[PDB]
Design a binder for these strands. Structure first.
Length: 252
DNA sequence: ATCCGTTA
DNA sequence: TAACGGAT
């Protein structure tokens, strides 16, 4: 099957991703910005216990690292009844220099799909932002406090990869993946490839071209260090769901 | 928690 | 001006 032919391309079998061709990202601040340190709001034991295994997993993966930084933003526990960590980066966002929004809206993106190409493959990349390294100079920006009362733990952690909740993450990811897939596009001029951050659609004129193109796209993505969800993959179908649309009979 | 634009 | 929804 597809899962077995391309072990490196799937999140399920290829391990955590890392975009090896992309330089670690440097995040420019606005001209008058200085660090802001917001105290961590006290967290309930219930929330802390819920969040803990996620933090530990990220530490084990090297995605979080200990740090000491003049920046600090609060971690929010957000439920489901399962607490997960959500960093409030709003005050960091306000101090980071704006970039032009280059990600197309889905409506316009889909306008680039011709009736000629009606065989589809849809992939979503797992933990997309985390595949992009953050330059060490920019890591301190995103620090938060992690305390474990019953383990004498108290200090800051920060991200070594592009973080969730950062205003520029979707745009920077979209632009990075475009750079990495530029060659694939050149090597396969007959294929249509739509990118919406971590949501991809490959379209072909025939089931064959689609299966061949999909094989190529999977091999390329895996080689570049990205990882797609095998669970959710829609491979070589006449009908697929993409960006909240049902694509069928060239409609939508 | 906190913030901020939109409705009531 | 008080809710309310959705946001990080």
């Amino acid at each position: 099957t597809w899962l077995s032919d391309f072990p490196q391309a799937w999140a399920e079998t290829g391990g955590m991703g890392l975009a090896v061709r992309q330089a670690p990202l440097i995040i420019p601040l606005k001209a008058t910005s200085t660090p802001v340190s917001i105290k961590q709001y006290p967290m309930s034991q219930e929330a802390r216990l819920g969040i803990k295994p996620h933090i530990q997993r990220l530490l084990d993966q090297g995605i979080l690292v200990p740090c000491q930084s003049p920046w600090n933003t609060p971690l929010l526990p957000v439920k489901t009844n399962d607490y997960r960590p959500v960093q409030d980066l709003r005050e960091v966002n306000k101090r980071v220099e704006d970039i032009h929004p280059t990600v197309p809206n889905p409506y316009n993106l889909l306008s680039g799909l011709p009736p000629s190409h009606q065989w589809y493959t849809v992939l979503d990349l797992k933990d997309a932002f985390f595949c992009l390294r953050l330059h060490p100079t920019s890591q301190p920006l995103f620090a938060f406090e992690w305390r474990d009362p019953e383990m004498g733990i108290s200090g800051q952690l920060t991200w070594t990869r592009l973080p969730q909740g950062f205003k520029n993450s979707p745009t920077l990811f979209d632009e990075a993946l475009h750079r990495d897939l530029a060659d694939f596009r050149i090597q396969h001029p007959d294929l249509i490839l739509l990118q919406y951050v971590d949501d991809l659609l490959l379209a072909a004129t025939s089931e064959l071209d689609c299966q061949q193109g999909t094989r190529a796209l999977l091999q390329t993505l895996g080689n570049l260090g990205y990882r797609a969800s095998a669970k959710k993959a829609q491979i070589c179908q006449k009908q697929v769901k993409y960006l909240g649309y049902l694509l069928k009979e060239g409609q939508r």
